Amino acid sequence: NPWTEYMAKYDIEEVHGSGIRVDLGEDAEVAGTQYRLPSGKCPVFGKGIIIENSNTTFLTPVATKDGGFAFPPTEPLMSPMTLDEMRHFYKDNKYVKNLDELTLCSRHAGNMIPDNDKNSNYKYPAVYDDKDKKCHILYIAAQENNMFCFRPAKDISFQNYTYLSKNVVDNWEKVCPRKNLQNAKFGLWVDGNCEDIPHVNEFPAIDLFECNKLVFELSASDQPKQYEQHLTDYEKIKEGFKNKNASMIKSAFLPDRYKSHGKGYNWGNYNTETQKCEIFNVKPTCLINNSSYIATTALSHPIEVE
Amino acid sequence: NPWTEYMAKYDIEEVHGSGIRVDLGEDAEVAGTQYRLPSGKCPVFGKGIIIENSNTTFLTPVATKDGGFAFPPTEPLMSPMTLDEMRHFYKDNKYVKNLDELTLCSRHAGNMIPDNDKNSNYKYPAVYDDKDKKCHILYIAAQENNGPRYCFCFRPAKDISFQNYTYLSKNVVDNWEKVCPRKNLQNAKFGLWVDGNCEDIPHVNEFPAIDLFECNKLVFELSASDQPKQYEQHLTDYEKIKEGFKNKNASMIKSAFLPTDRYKSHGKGYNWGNYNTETQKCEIFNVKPTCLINNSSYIATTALSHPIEVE
Ligand SMILES: [Cl-]
């Protein structure tokens, strides 16, 4: 396969390794309880959280329903923090001060100790705003609760946002998707040629944005499948919550089932001419030269094209 | 309610009466020990077993690791057996010879005596393959074994590879076509009849589902299960019997701990789904539906139902 090195970034199971729509791919103890937390190795471009029946944006600091998901005021203020502020903050750290924008944001979020637990490996995720050059640390690592109903989504208002786990790798631009591939269709390398993906499901999509949106909706998810009828502390932890009104969430019921490990309907071929989004769940291993198509993934930016 | 007679086949507790994802709804003695075995009265369309970290397919005869779940070769060969071979085999039996292929495969499997036990009521289940018109008697009636322990690990699933298979207990009824679900209902949504109207099911759990097959898979996964929740440390002989195993390498499995109804669903579960084809959402619920709503955006499915076939 002449396509192996090129196609490496599209093996989402390998290179990302956790959920995309909902990333809760690891567990980490904070003060004696194991909490779920995002753990994917790639940035998720254009991902944010929509709070339903509300005008509050999710990057609004948590209420200390009026509030969002972001870190409340700390002293000194750790979040939000601009790119320049971050580089100045870490000036004495050779291995941190020069990391790319997104990786720096991830590492910065990763320096926030949870709940004065100095032993803990738990690290908060973050959102980077590329327009504002601002890093927002998320206090709430839950992504879907469908007190607050909400869901993850690509939305036109989120196009400059990137959702970042603690695990985002420093060379993500070499090894992860970002841009959509114009004039290219994902395929499978079989006996010296790029063949069509055998099984695809097709949907109407007015533009590339709408196709990327759909793929995202259907992509790898670490959200629980079985769960009680009412919200319970056990259900909250399974959704990625850690804190409730001034105490940690605990549950006698906590002892790997919910982890996708990157498995899902993560790829799409958008036919710009017929306005159909072609969605599949096997990793592609080549490209087909087809001028009618744009190749997208749930990780990819919903608009940007190369 | 004008829907009563029409909706009877969606009363899964009544018409099927056992687990769907894992069906172990009866016990039957073989050589002095009670074993668990499938007892559902309806066929389960598109159900097979996935063996983990293995190149072995579940319809391969048992190893006699390299093996599956199917009957080892017998003389005369009783399994696998084609429809035509079955009809010829039972040519002298008026009551069996002209049964529908599914009920026939169930009855054929039910004629295998377990472990030379002349008067046992234990009857092996079977899988009928509609593509090759072959009946496969299963020697292993276990359907799930994947505890954190050592995970020969396996689980039940609907999968594209299994779409022409039907998993058949010994109790599959001869008139299943009239009394059991099979086809999904296109342009229809399950509801509840309230005051001269078909109303929405009050509580549904909603999930993303790219197509009807995926919705049907999800419903099956959440459906009535007779599996022990008793996932514990090592796999003990008692645990094996609770999982539906009967044999282990030249002896019956036995246990002093076997008491002489707790893991039986009797068909109670998240057995139904309304799939919204326009929003790609699978809405799953655990109460029997009692009418249909005319909605072009939906397809009504059950855990029993074929994962593709529509009406
Ligand atoms: Cl029982």
From TrEMBL, chain B:
Task: Tell me the keywords, alphabetical order.
Answer: Disulfide bond, Glycoprotein, Membrane, Signal, Transmembrane, Transmembrane helix
Q: List cystine links.
A: C42-C180, C105-C135, C151-C153, C198-C291, C215-C282
GO molecular-function term, one example from the UniProt record: host cell surface binding
Name where it's found.
Membrane
Task: Identify its membrane topology class.
Answer: Single-pass type I membrane protein
Q: Where is the major localization of this protein?
A: membrane
Top-rank taxon, per record: Eukaryota
Picking any one GO biological process from the record gives:
symbiont entry into host
Q: Which GO terms describe its cellular component?
A: apical complex; membrane; microneme
Q: In UniProt terms, what function does this protein have?
A: Involved in parasite invasion of erythrocytes.
Family the UniProt entry places it in: Belongs to the apicomplexan parasites AMA1 family.
UniProt-recorded name of the protein: Apical membrane antigen 1
